[PDB]
Ligand binder design. Structure first.
Ligand code: SM6
Length: 262
C-alpha cells in the first residue's frame, strides 16, 4: 500500500523549472513522471514539515482533474513523484507561446478547473496558490490541477484582496480559492494577465488591497457568453462572502456549456 519509493528507483533527468519548495524534473519511474525535488544536502525541520504536509494532502486526492500523485522519496533527497503531462501549463499556453484557443475549448478548460476544485473543497482542501501556472494541460485536452505545496486541510495576481492586505491571522478560505479561479477565468476569456497596463507591482499590491483596482472585465472577447461574464464578476467580488462556492460555480459552467454548440 504505502507510497515510499526505495532509493535507486527514480531516474532523474532534465531539469524543467521550479515549484513550491523544490526543483522540478522530468523523470522515469514505470514510464514518464514529473519529479519535484529539494536537492538540499540536509533538510531543515522547516522543510521536512512542508514536505510531509504536501504528501499528506496529495494522498487524499484521486481525481481526473487533480495531478495524479504517484509516490514520494526521502532517500537520496526529499522528492514527490507525479504523472507526466506532455504539453505545457495553462500560463505557458496563454502568455508565452500564445495559443489561440477556440471559445468552446476555453470554457471546457474552465469547466475542468472548476471540476477539480469542487473535488478538493469537497475534501476540505484549500489550494492557496491556484494560478494558471498550476493548471496543467495533459495532451492538450485534459486539465490537471497541480502543485499542492501551499495547500491545507509569491504570485500576487491571483490573490484575493483579503489575502493581499495580510489580516487577520488566516485570510485563506474556499472563497479566496474561488477568487483565484476568477482570475484564471479572466486569463481564459481575455488571453491577458490582469492589470497588464500597470508596470509597478507595489502599486498593484497596494491598490487591490484597498480595493481601488479590480480586473477590467470589459476586456473579455466579444464571443464570450453573457452568462460567463456574469460568473466572472461573481467570483471577483471584493467582499469574500459575496462569492459563490464551487458546487454552484460548476453548475453554471455546465449550464452555459449545453446551450453553446447550438
Ligand atoms: C516549465 C515549468 O513547468 C513545471 O514546473 C512543470 S512541467 C510539468 C509536467 N508534468 C507535470 C508537472 C509539471 C510541472 N510542475 C510541477 C509542479 C508541482 C509538482 C510537480 C511538478 C511534481 C510534484 C509537485 N508538487 O505537487
Amino acid at each position: 500500500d504505502d507510497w515510499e519509493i526505495p532509493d535507486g528507483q527514480i531516474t532523474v533527468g532534465q531539469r524543467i523549472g521550479s515549484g513550491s519548495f523544490g526543483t522540478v524534473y522530468k523523470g522515469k519511474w514505470h514510464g514518464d513522471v514529473a519529479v519535484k525535488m529539494l536537492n538540499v544536502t540536509a533538510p531543515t525541520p522547516q522543510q521536512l514539515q512542508a514536505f510531509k504536509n504536501e504528501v499528506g494532502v496529495l494522498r487524499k486526492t484521486r481525481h481526473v482533474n487533480i495531478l495524479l500523485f504517484m509516490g514520494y522519496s526521502t532517500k537520496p533527497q526529499l522528492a514527490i513523484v507525479t504523472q507526466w503531462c506532455e504539453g505545457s501549463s495553462l500560463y505557458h499556453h496563454l502568455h508565452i507561446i500564445e495559443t489561440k484557443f477556440e471559445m468552446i475549448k476555453l470554457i471546457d478548460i474552465a469547466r475542468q478547473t472548476a471540476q477539480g476544485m469542487d473535488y478538493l473543497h469537497a475534501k476540505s482542501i484549500i489550494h492557496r496558490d491556484l494560478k494558471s501556472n498550476n493548471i496543467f494541460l495533459h495532451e492538450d485536452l485534459t486539465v490537471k490541477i497541480g502543485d499542492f505545496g501551499l495547500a491545507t486541510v509569491g504570485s500576487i495576481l491571483w490573490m484575493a484582496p483579503e489575502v493581499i492586505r495580510m489580516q487577520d491571522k488566516n485570510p485563506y478560505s474556499f472563497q479566496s480559492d474561488v477568487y483565484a479561479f476568477g482570475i484564471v477565468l479572466y486569463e481564459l476569456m481575455t488571453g491577458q494577465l490582469p492589470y497588464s497596463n500597470i508596470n509597478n507591482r507595489d502599486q498593484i499590491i497596494f491598490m487591490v488591497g484597498r480595493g481601488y483596482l479590480s480586473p477590467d472585465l470589459s476586456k473579455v472577447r466579444s464571443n464570450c457568453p453573457k452568462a460567463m461574464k456574469r460568473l466572472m464578476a461573481e467570483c471577483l467580488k471584493k467582499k469574500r462572502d459575496e462569492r459563490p462556492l464551487f458546487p454552484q460555480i460548476l453548475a453554471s459552467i455546465e449550464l452555459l456549456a449545453r446551450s453553446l454548440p447550438k
